[PDB]
């Protein structure tokens, strides 16, 4: 997260770290058994680390749980990173407590101008902001006109832009898969951009509100 601040510990209790040797993507706990992340973060088995604030220190709050199933959206497209959403089923349910709490799925799509929070342990492009401690940033959703003007012909219905066209504040590498939460609902998943925090290149996010049908039917299993 570039241009943000260290989160109050456990203020984003849905935030998870996906780890396979080291932190490589974030995710969001949506109930005791399932995590939502980005489809490009796919690995066939991952360890999900919950209750984290500083990922390099054991603090006592952590739960580390292996995945049992990692399911990419059927229409994910790696060429253009379209439909970039994935579900991870935990091999055992998370214990919900002060440190670990799910985030609600959206009841409707949030309109442009809504203020949201994005968080993660990715690159901060700063000598003073430590990416091992969870960083937080407040970003507005941008209109489709601004988003498509920044990235001509690249923005699909499964994507939205959020951030600042002036640059300076953005998500960055190592934040993929993490939450964009707006008024207590998971509206976006960190997905892609041209660099990080560059003028005229706001971050692009997977639009969760159009995936409610697939998310809730898949979390039912078979």
């Amino acid at each position: 997260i570039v241009g943000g601040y260290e989160c109050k510990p456990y203020s984003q209790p849905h935030q998870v770290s996906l780890n396979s040797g080291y932190h490589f993507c974030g995710g969001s706990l949506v109930n005791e058994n399932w995590v939502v992340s980005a489809a490009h973060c796919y690995k066939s088995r991952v360890e999900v680390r919950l209750g984290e604030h500083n990922i390099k220190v054991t603090e006592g709050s952590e739960q580390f749980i292996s995945s049992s199933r990692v399911i990419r959206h059927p229409n994910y497209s790696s060429y253009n990173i379209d439909n970039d959403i994935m579900l991870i089923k935990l091999s055992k349910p998370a214990t919900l407590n002060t440190y670990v709490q799910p985030v609600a799925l959206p009841t409707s799509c949030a309109p442009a101008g809504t203020m949201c929070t994005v968080s993660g342990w990715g690159n901060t492009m700063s000598s003073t902001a430590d990416s091992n401690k969870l960083q937080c940033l407040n970003i507005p959703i941008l209109s489709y006109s601004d988003c498509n003007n920044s990235y001509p012909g690249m923005i699909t219905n499964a994507m939205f832009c959020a951030g600042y066209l002036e640059g300076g504040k953005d998500s960055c590498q190592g934040d993929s898969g993490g939450p964009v939460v707006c008024n207590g609902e998971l509206q976006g998943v960190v997905s892609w951009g041209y660099g990080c925090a560059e003028p005229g290149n706001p971050g692009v996010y997977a639009k969760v509100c159009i995936f409610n049908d697939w998310l809730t039917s898949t979390m039912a299993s078979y």
Partner: peptide, 29 residues
């Protein structure tokens, strides 16, 4: 340069996803 925000170690551009390149520090960006 569509570059997904995943943290990925690289030695060459070909290690990275989409239009990410291997930056000097040994990671895609």
């Amino acid at each position: 340069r569509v570059c997904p925000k995943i943290l990925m170690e690289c030695k060459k551009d070909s290690d990275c996803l989409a239009e990410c390149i291997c930056l000097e520090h040994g990671y895609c960006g």
